[PDB]
Amino acid sequence: VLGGDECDINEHPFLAFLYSHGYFCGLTLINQEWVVTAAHCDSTNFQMQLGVHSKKVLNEDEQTRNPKEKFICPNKNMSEVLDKDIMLIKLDKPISNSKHIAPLSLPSNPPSVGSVCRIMGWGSITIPNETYPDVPYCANINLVDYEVCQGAYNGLPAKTTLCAGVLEGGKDTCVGDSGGPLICNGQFQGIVSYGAHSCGQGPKPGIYTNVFDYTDWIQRNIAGNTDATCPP
């Protein structure tokens, strides 16, 4: 993240951690059993770290889990990078709410453009470089036009995408923030997916998986409709 502050511990207990060779992707806890993230973030053999705050100091209660099950959109293009960039992860063992661990509630209404939302993660903190933080970082952005996504990125973003950024630039996600949350009013709204290098460019906002378009599919799976698919 760029143009922001180290994150407060009260605001990232939903953020999970994907590691095997090292660091792969951020994640979000939606409840004691289930974690969410981007399809693009699938690695073949990986694990979960819940409630990580500072590299320099491990708080009394990190939690390590494995992927019992995973799900991707059934109607998805297997090759095309960005279409339906979403994946659930059933943890092999349920997790409890403590200081450093707590779920994020799902969207009931979608975010009306021009709202002020919060991005976060362990990605690069800089415009050009790879400078990695010790605690996650936070920043306020706005939700913007679907034309300012299509004006910025000559490849058509999915009808199932959120567009956020700071019009004039200066606050954006970065290399390694993929699969992180975009939170608006206590509610989880978008999933970090792609943007541009360098981060923070004027009229070049970031692209997120429109969590609200798949909240039905999220729940369908969570109830047991393995057949169920996402809206094209």
Curated annotation (Swiss-Prot):
Glycosylation sites recorded in the entry for this protein: N77, N129
Record-level GO BP terms: proteolysis
Location of the active site: H40, D85, S178
Gene Ontology CC: extracellular region; secretory granule
GO molecular function, one term: toxin activity
Keyword Secreted attributed: yes
Primary enzyme class: hydrolase
Domain of life from the UniProt record: Eukaryota
The protein's Enzyme Commission number: 3.4.21.-
Disulfide bridge positions per record: C7-C138, C25-C41, C73-C230, C117-C184, C149-C163, C174-C199
Keywords in alphabetical order: Blood coagulation cascade activating toxin, Disulfide bond, Fibrinolytic toxin, Glycoprotein, Hemostasis impairing toxin, Hydrolase, Protease, Secreted, Serine protease, Sialic acid, Toxin
Stretches assigned to the Peptidase S1 domain: 1-223
Chief location category: secreted
Function: Thrombin-like enzyme that shows clotting activity upon human plasma. Shows specific fibrinogenolytic activity for Aalpha chain (FGA). Subcutaneous injection into mice induces a mild edema. Intravenous and intramuscular injection reduce plasma fibrinogen concentration and increase the levels of fibrin(ogen) degradation products.
Family named by the database record: Belongs to the peptidase S1 family. Snake venom subfamily.
Protein name: Thrombin-like enzyme BjussuSP-1
Organism for this UniProt entry: Bothrops jararacussu
